[PDB]
Design a protein around this ligand. Structure first.
Ligand code: MG
Ligand code: MG
Lengths: 251, 251, 251, 251
């Protein structure tokens, strides 16, 4: 409690799954939060299920939309005050090998997973620098930003891109005394509704040859590391990768 | 507050600097703590400065002493109950290149930095497994476990050793459902009394070519990540490296 | 000599600098080579300076051009026979931080550095698999695929993307017994004509805080590791990163 | 051929398996070689099977023996001239988890795998620096220096130690213009007589969940990368890790 007092956060794709868990924990720890998503009926219900409008609101936004990012920041500033924290969580996956990836699939996945993160990071630096906010940008990568998967070619590309681009941002902000930190979070397999809609997926992911703990994680596992990174507790951490994967990348 | 309720922790080298900060934060979050050190006059004062004997006590111990580790665990169990958490923090450094390292220096440094961590990890697994404690072993490595330094040859060796040995332990505990997690923490440069006793050291470490943030960290920077790893918040994290270095390894 | 006998290679951006050195060494070791570039006057001169048309030819191509890639492969097959080796070397750099990167700059850099490599890797797998060629795709990444640089945001992104996407490809080819290997090469600073056209660049890159050897490399340094990876000597290497950087990433 | 002309190399544990393959290829490429081993009957036969005494000789040596290292260098200098190349290949493995490792096992494994490599690296720097030899120290690590294995605790420790200690050495030699390079080689599973004496081992190692290529490697796979690193072709490579593992660490 109170670990995020005074912070104002934007969480993209925060209406379901991991994003929603992060939003929930952020509000519990004193942050004011704006969550984004594509469908207003879902977003408005999600916000209300967490708290009141003085605590959390919803903004309809596709992270691939460059102009919408501006409106998103202006809207959050109008509701809560200067933004201190950005969690770039929205993302999509295609289940194809590099060999079988269509150009259309390639471009659509990179629009959300890479362009989107770039647009949010760029703008976040511009709006949060030099304001004494103890600002923090948390970019969601994945274990797929460390290792390959034969059936996630484009996704691998996007997550590898986010991992290193984030280091460039971290360094520039640090060297210029911007008071903005940038770090990546790398979840392993996490139980989300999606996973539940895919019979046999959880069991395959839980095999010891994949996840040594023999079970997959839950959204709160990612929420707690995000609280640490958004908080002033992590004031000396920037340009780093934080992995929560049940041992997946240790073998 | 309450993030470590019920946990019982041993912190080696916990009478000064980083170890003391970890102990302090652990007690603040509800853990019972046993700190170790070489000098009883310092250790007893350190404990008292943090809390009462029902909260924290001191045990005289050199981490290179295999037999003493047993006594250390027996003593903590007698004072607080079953041990759930071990922070292997004690370590020493020699300022020599591989070329100029004497065999004596080599062996003494590895006795504390590597043998000591092995002895504590081995015993910790044996004493903490299968007890439903949500057990966690936090092994202190360093940025020097990721990158070389021309004047820290032996230290590099020890920290590289701890980094990967910890992954072996993590995997074995995970695969056997031992309910023990093992992770490493990698501090960059941190302001400790030692550093203060070395004129010009802080300034050299703060140069942007070394630490991009242009300043070094403080003991609490390491304490907060240790709270996260000792807590049940990190229940899906094992075999991973957590870096808090002001950007040192990002460039 | 004879280390690449029978191999047929495409090297993108092979008319100057690093690409030209790779082409030169490939021809010396018995490979037949097709080099690409944007300007035919330069390309045709480059080819002739290395060998005869039975050894090396030029094809005008921009790696961002998806359709041209097909023509490129058809043209090489017509001149030399089935393609066994692809070096994805063409790339551009923008000297901007993430904060200052325009969207136009972002898209143009990714078109060459990421889309281009994807288009070539995808097609290479399709054309080279299951032909017993001992096929090898060498994707040029960079030290900037491991660490950030505050003034190379987009470039970092592209090189981080290539690094991990290549692992996905390697795995899929290995698991399917395609007889195609995929690896990345990571040059540090190398003296090319470009560098020479930038007064003070070589000296800045040679500072010990950047390149510990105190000098930058030369194109042949990259050519020799590419010979190894294209040859059957590296038949058990796939999904790996090969770094030739004068110590840059070791500190 | 001729890739190692003029080089004088010591290869520890060079009487069998990987070491012998390296020695064989070194002699083929023009190097003069001294191989070491524990049994003279085996060593003398091994040398003779490769070439004449003007090309290759045997020296009885246990790499854990500090004093013997001096005699080893003096003996090689007397036979071939100044030593330019050192391959620290000798090593042993214990098949135990950290939990089940005896202290005796711990110390004996580190004596060979870590102390031995330190003794050879230290002395190699001292004897090879500043002689214009294009000197190179190749330290044999392993995929087990990157990832954990639940049943190779001590081995993991030793290989993680070698990986980072080597970077310290590389940096010191580079910064001081010693003309000595230090790099590590990381083999995945390789078919050696040992493996053959263990029924079911090769099949277990060849499973796709372990080695994606579906088969293990052969000693020449390691020999060829060692030729590259010992040669002047790799003159700009130092402090780096070279992985040849059939995709093991890519997933
Ligand atoms: Mg793995
Ligand atoms: Mg660095």
């Amino acid at each position: 409690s109170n670990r995020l007092d005074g912070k104002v956060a934007i969480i993209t794709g925060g209406t379901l799954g991991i994003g929603l868990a992060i939003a929930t924990k952020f509000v519990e720890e004193g942050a004011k939060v704006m969550i984004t998503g594509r469908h207003s009926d879902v977003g408005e219900k999600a916000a209300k299920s967490v708290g009141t409008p003085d605590q959390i609101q919803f903004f309809q936004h596709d992270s691939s939309d460059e102009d919408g990012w501006t409106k998103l920041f202006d809207a959050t500033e109008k509701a809560f005050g200067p933004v201190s924290t950005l969690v770039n969580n929205a993302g999509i996956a295609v289940n194809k090998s590099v060999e079988e990836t269509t150009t259309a699939e390639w471009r659509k996945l990179l629009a959300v997973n890479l362009d989107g993160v770039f647009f949010g990071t760029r703008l976040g630096i511009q709006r949060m620098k030099n304001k004494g906010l103890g600002a923090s940008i948390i970019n969601m990568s994945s274990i797929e930003g460390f290792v390959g998967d034969p059936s996630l070619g484009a996704y691998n590309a996007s997550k590898g891109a986010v991992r290193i681009m984030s280091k460039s941002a971290a360094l520039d902000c640090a060297l210029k005394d911007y008071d903005v930190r940038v770090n990546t979070v790398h979840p392993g397999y996490i139980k989300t509704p999606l996973v539940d809609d895919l019979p046999g997926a959880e069991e395959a992911m839980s095999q010891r040859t994949k996840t040594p703990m023999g079970h997959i994680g839950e959204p709160n596992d990612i929420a707690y590391i995000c609280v640490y990174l958004a908080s002033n507790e992590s004031k000396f951490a920037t340009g780093s990768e934080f992995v929560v994967d049940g041992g997946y990348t240790a073998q």
